[PDB]
Prior knowledge:
Family (chain B): Belongs to the RNA polymerase beta' chain family.
Bound molecules: magnesium ion, zinc ion
Strand content of chain H: under 5%
Number of domains of chain H: 1
Shape of chain C: flat
Structural class of chain C: alpha+beta
Strand order of the largest sheet of chain C: 1-2-12-9-11-10
Distance between the termini of chain C: 37 Å
Subunit structure (chain B): Part of the RNA polymerase complex.
Radius of gyration of chain C: 25 Å
Oligomer: part of a larger assembly
Subcellular location (chain B): Cytoplasm
Largest sheet of chain H: none
Helix content of chain H: 25-40%
Largest sheet of chain C: 6 strands, antiparallel
Function (chain B): DNA-dependent RNA polymerase catalyzes the transcription of DNA into RNA using the four ribonucleoside triphosphates as substrates.
Organism (chain B): Thermococcus kodakarensis (strain ATCC BAA-918 / JCM 12380 / KOD1) (Pyrococcus kodakaraensis (strain KOD1))
Amino acid sequence: YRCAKCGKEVELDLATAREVRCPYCGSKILYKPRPRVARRVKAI
Amino acid sequence: TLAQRLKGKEGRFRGNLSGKRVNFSARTVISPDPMISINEVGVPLAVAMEL
Amino acid sequence: VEFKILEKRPDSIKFIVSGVDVPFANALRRTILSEVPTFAVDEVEFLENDSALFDEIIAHRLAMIPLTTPHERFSLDALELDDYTVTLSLEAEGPGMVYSGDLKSSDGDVKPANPNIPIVKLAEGQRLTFNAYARLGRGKDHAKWQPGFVYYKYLTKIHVSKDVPDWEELKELAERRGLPVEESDEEIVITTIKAFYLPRKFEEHMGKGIREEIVPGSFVFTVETNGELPVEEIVSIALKILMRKSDRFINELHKLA
Amino acid sequence: MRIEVIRREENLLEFYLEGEDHTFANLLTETLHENEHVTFAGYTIEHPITMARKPRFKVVTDGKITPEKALEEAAQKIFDRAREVLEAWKAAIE
Amino acid sequence: YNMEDAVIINKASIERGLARSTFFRTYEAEEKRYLGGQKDNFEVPSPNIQGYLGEKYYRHLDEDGLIFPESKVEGKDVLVGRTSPPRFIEEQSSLGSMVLQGRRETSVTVRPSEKGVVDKVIVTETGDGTKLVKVTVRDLRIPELGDKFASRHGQKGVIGLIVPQEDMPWTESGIVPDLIVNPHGIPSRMTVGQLIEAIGGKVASLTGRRVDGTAFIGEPEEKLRKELEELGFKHSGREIMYDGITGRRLEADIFIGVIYYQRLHHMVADKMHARSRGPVQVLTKQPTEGRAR
Amino acid sequence: VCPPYNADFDGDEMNLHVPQTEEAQAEAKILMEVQNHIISPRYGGPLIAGIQDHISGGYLLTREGAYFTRYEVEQMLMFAGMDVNELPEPDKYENGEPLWS
Amino acid sequence: FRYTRFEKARIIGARALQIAMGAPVLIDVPEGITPLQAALLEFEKGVIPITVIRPS
Amino acid sequence: MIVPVRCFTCGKVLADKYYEFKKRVEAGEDPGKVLDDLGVERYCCRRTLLSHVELIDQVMVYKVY
DNA sequence: TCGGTAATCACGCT
Ligand SMILES: [Mg+2]
Ligand SMILES: [Zn+2]
Ligand SMILES: [Zn+2]
């Protein structure tokens, strides 16, 4: 389990053991989305 | 084969025996300063803490 | 010692100072740049950034926004700067251009001076959230803490005798750029309150007929800010630092003996 | 601002001055020059990347006054001279 | 400091935006299948397994073995944790290895001199049946010393030092120069197109219209120096300049213009390395080649 | 020291390597320091010497008409290393003002 | 009887290695000094025990 | 790559006076009088309005989540 | 004279 977001928007939370496809789009390529935690960058 | 391992402009007289790779070195770029004496040199503090 | 205020405008001033000398003018000039403190954003905490720009770049623009620094509520002549921090937060969602004026401040005396600055453009469904922390600093440590600029020039007088062919061309030329000209039957005197590019025909006469004489002790000052401090407070604050700075010396000297 | 002496001799004083820069050092130098008893006033910043906050000052007198005494009274004047200009400035924007 | 092809860029001008350039790399770790039937899956490595790289380099990974984005990966930090399949279960029997039966750790980790933050993690499948993940990590890279600049006329050089805005020789207007170029390089290399362009930057910034400068049919030489001469300046660029350390007019007229430069990728953080005692050659037991090894 | 190395500063690369054992280190200091190599074995003449600004600065110092004032003499003797006492003396041409040659 | 430049850099080299392996030092003390720098001060006062052989 | 909010030499804000500048040059008016009509005095302020790319439009639409 | 064959052709770095 994960929550990968593909090209042309959509969500697809599946696993990792068998196959990696998007049911709605029909594609197979995935970006892992950014988290929602707080990091600290200085301005220089 | 053997005669090309012994020889061949990068064999085992010039390639590995009479010219070897060494330890305790560094390599970076140069940039002037006319405030130190004639026989001193600057050394970065990153290279100075790894030698 | 005397002053002559030529003009006062929003974020600019020009004046003439008399009764001083060459070393003092540089000390006054450098002090405005490297001693006067202002507030500036020093660190930004990101929660999410879906924009077209990198985290570092958005953080970099926040630091370049000039913030109002109320001089009647802290201390600008201290050797030890105050550490009071003001928090600038933002929570927006596209589409639309995000402006500097939308940043909210927890303290009404520290706000962006110019509200029409665009920070970043946002497309459909992209969110931008951050928290900015501002603190006092000096220009010598980082360029973001600069209150403005100062430029100064000598004050000179160009004497043009009427024996120079086509001297009438310089009178109209000087009048176009606003330099005062006092004319008499012997010659004319041009006061160079700003740069005076000599036209090419008169180069051979520079020194023979046309000569420049420096007026001892008078300097034309130009000070311009960006809106963080009034154009009148600046020179007063810098002078009060010099006094304080060169008094500590006397204290420290006695301690040695 | 702690004065770090190096050489101390007869009618001569050399020292380092932490926390200062070109701005103050040049102003104190030519102001000192005005004193006829000060034979020699000068400063240098050495290599402005490794150190740019401790100018090296040197004050030499003719023996009729000590180097510390000369320095002391000459940094009085700058405090008084700034005190003048400031009064002028304030009472002029009216 | 700007002797024999150096250059002295301003301090406050670096610190507002000049030449702030970014640098990217990418990594292409995969999941192969051997012909025996054993397929190596990637996950979080357990403490036991043979050939451990180290510990507390695994603080950024998720459960399955993928870095959740925007994390300051630096040094030799890992990127994807890979478990490999046994590789000769019965050769050694090193007094406890008969019972352990585990795996031989192989993985991917950043090259041991860089820094930066990840940007986007890809995950897909390539043609046959396997899986391959692409991870890319960026960097910020402010322009400090060493960083080679050049014009398009051939005046290459390196930042000499980085002098503050206060100590700058400035002019009888609001101008404070950026790049104080060495004057010993212009009447030695015969690059007169540098000096014509410097007037052409001052003319085409005050007039409003970008001066055409193409070969053989462009803007002529003499017509520029009249358009500058009626807009308020001397016919040859030269201006009255005051030094910033002491403050008195330098008894010369210092030349000044606008020249288009360009930064080059011979930047200094990709050159510096030090080696005390590292991994050696297998055949001779002599040090390796390159900074990547 | 940049006619022995035959270098310039357009992004070159120079490598140092520390010697370690106490016999090979006291040999490096006595036999290989820079000041022993001020003249060269190819022609006798000096090799480590002045370059671009060091020549053309020295012409502006020794021109007939190079009269420095009192502040500029005293400032430059502090910057060029030397240690002299209160003897910048004796103000050789006081014709305009008391300034040196 | 002046030394050459090759003999002066060998006498220091052998004496700086003995001064690290024991071999009690002459009047050379102050405050902290690397074993190479101790041999340089001893050679200036002319109290070196080590002599050369000149084949002739 | 949206306009830099300072100049690079003279510290002075500029991003409020770029989108008012370009919408009055797409009517045919000469830029020599438009930049003079605003508060631009030197030519160090002025070399960085007169030469810019405004490339944020192309990159934005390409998207990455 | 006269024909035949090998054996040779910067430094460092990615
Ligand atoms: Mg080179
Ligand atoms: Zn999809
Ligand atoms: Zn500018």
